[PDB]
Design a protein around this motif. Structure first.
Motif, PDB file in Angstrom:
ATOM      1  N   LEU A   2       0.841  -1.186   0.000  1.00 13.69           N
ATOM      2  CA  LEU A   2       0.000   0.000   0.000  1.00 13.69           C
ATOM      3  C   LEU A   2       0.885   1.248   0.000  1.00 13.69           C
ATOM      4  O   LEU A   2       0.819   2.060   0.921  1.00 13.69           O
ATOM      5  CB  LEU A   2      -0.995  -0.048   1.162  1.00 13.69           C
ATOM      6  N   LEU A   3       1.694   1.360  -1.044  1.00 15.91           N
ATOM      7  CA  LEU A   3       2.538   2.531  -1.213  1.00 15.91           C
ATOM      8  C   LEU A   3       1.986   3.393  -2.349  1.00 15.91           C
ATOM      9  O   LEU A   3       1.220   2.912  -3.182  1.00 15.91           O
ATOM     10  CB  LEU A   3       3.997   2.114  -1.411  1.00 15.91           C
ATOM     11  N   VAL A   4       2.395   4.653  -2.346  1.00 11.89           N
ATOM     12  CA  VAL A   4       1.969   5.581  -3.379  1.00 11.89           C
ATOM     13  C   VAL A   4       3.190   6.318  -3.932  1.00 11.89           C
ATOM     14  O   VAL A   4       3.478   7.443  -3.525  1.00 11.89           O
ATOM     15  CB  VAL A   4       0.901   6.526  -2.826  1.00 11.89           C
ATOM     16  N   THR A   5       3.973   5.618  -4.801  1.00  9.47           N
ATOM     17  CA  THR A   5       5.064   6.305  -5.471  1.00  9.47           C
ATOM     18  C   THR A   5       4.735   6.514  -6.950  1.00  9.47           C
ATOM     19  O   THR A   5       3.578   6.409  -7.352  1.00  9.47           O
ATOM     20  CB  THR A   5       6.343   5.495  -5.241  1.00  9.47           C
ATOM     21  N   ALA A   6       5.773   6.807  -7.719  1.00  9.57           N
ATOM     22  CA  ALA A   6       5.593   7.165  -9.115  1.00  9.57           C
ATOM     23  C   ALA A   6       6.683   6.521  -9.976  1.00  9.57           C
ATOM     24  O   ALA A   6       7.673   7.167 -10.315  1.00  9.57           O
ATOM     25  CB  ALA A   6       5.566   8.692  -9.212  1.00  9.57           C
ATOM     26  N   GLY A   7       6.463   5.257 -10.303  1.00  7.83           N
ATOM     27  CA  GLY A   7       7.426   4.506 -11.159  1.00  7.83           C
ATOM     28  C   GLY A   7       7.328   2.975 -11.268  1.00  7.83           C
ATOM     29  O   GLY A   7       7.371   2.311 -12.292  1.00  7.83           O
ATOM     30  N   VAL A   9       5.151   0.607  -8.942  1.00  8.51           N
ATOM     31  CA  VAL A   9       4.411   0.184  -7.764  1.00  8.51           C
ATOM     32  C   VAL A   9       4.566  -1.327  -7.585  1.00  8.51           C
ATOM     33  O   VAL A   9       4.434  -2.086  -8.545  1.00  8.51           O
ATOM     34  CB  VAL A   9       2.951   0.628  -7.876  1.00  8.51           C
TER      35      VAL A   9
END
Lengths: 11, 165
Positions: A2-7, A9
């Motif tokens: 349940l992470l919210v990164t940009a590249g 997931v």
């Protein structure tokens, strides 16, 4: 997971 | 400081579900709020007007859009394809927290997300620069038809973007 990164997931 | 307001409409398969608006704390961060503001109207060669969603997990977060350039992972900002951070004076009180997404230090592309719960492990990492005043109901309605498999109500897309100048 349940992470919210940009590249690349993961669980 | 006369904070601006922004919103955009969600479409559940060629059907308008409703509008979701957000109030930004430009007072505190009269810089990174603009990034969001611009991403609505979606000029500057990007924005949320790509009619597409990434994923919706029920009981965590909700967002989507932006990027759109690199196999559905585009994204540049009005300050470049990257941009520094501001601070973490704000925190994650729980649901209705509008937080950014990042892929490293001084690397805040643009994409954000709604926190529909106490994301305590994101606090200190993500920048909180606004809250969901009204629309949480629509977000909830949206999440209700979401899944962890990365599919949501068939195919949810951004209907149109707002930007309340």
């Amino acid at each position: 997971x349940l992470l919210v990164t940009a590249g690349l997931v993961l669980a | 400081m006369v904070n601006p307001t922004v919103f955009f409409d969600i479409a559940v398969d060629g059907e308008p579900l409703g509008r979701v608006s957000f109030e930004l704390f430009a007072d505190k961060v009269p810089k990174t709020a603009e990034n969001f503001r611009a991403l609505s109207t979606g000029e500057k060669g990007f924005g949320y007007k790509g009619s597409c969603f990434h994923r919706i997990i029920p009981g965590f977060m909700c967002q989507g859009g932006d990027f759109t350039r690199h196999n559905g992972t585009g994204g540049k900002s009005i300050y470049g394809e990257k941009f520094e951070d501001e601070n973490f004076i704000l925190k994650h009180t729980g649901p209705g927290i509008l937080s950014m997404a990042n892929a490293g230090p001084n690397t805040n592309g643009s994409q954000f997300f709604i926190c529909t719960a106490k994301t305590e492990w994101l606090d200190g990492k993500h920048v909180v620069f606004g809250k969901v005043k009204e629309g949480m109901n629509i977000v909830e309605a949206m999440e209700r038809f979401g899944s962890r498999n990365g599919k949501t109500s068939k195919k949810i897309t951004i209907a149109d973007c707002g930007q309340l100048e």
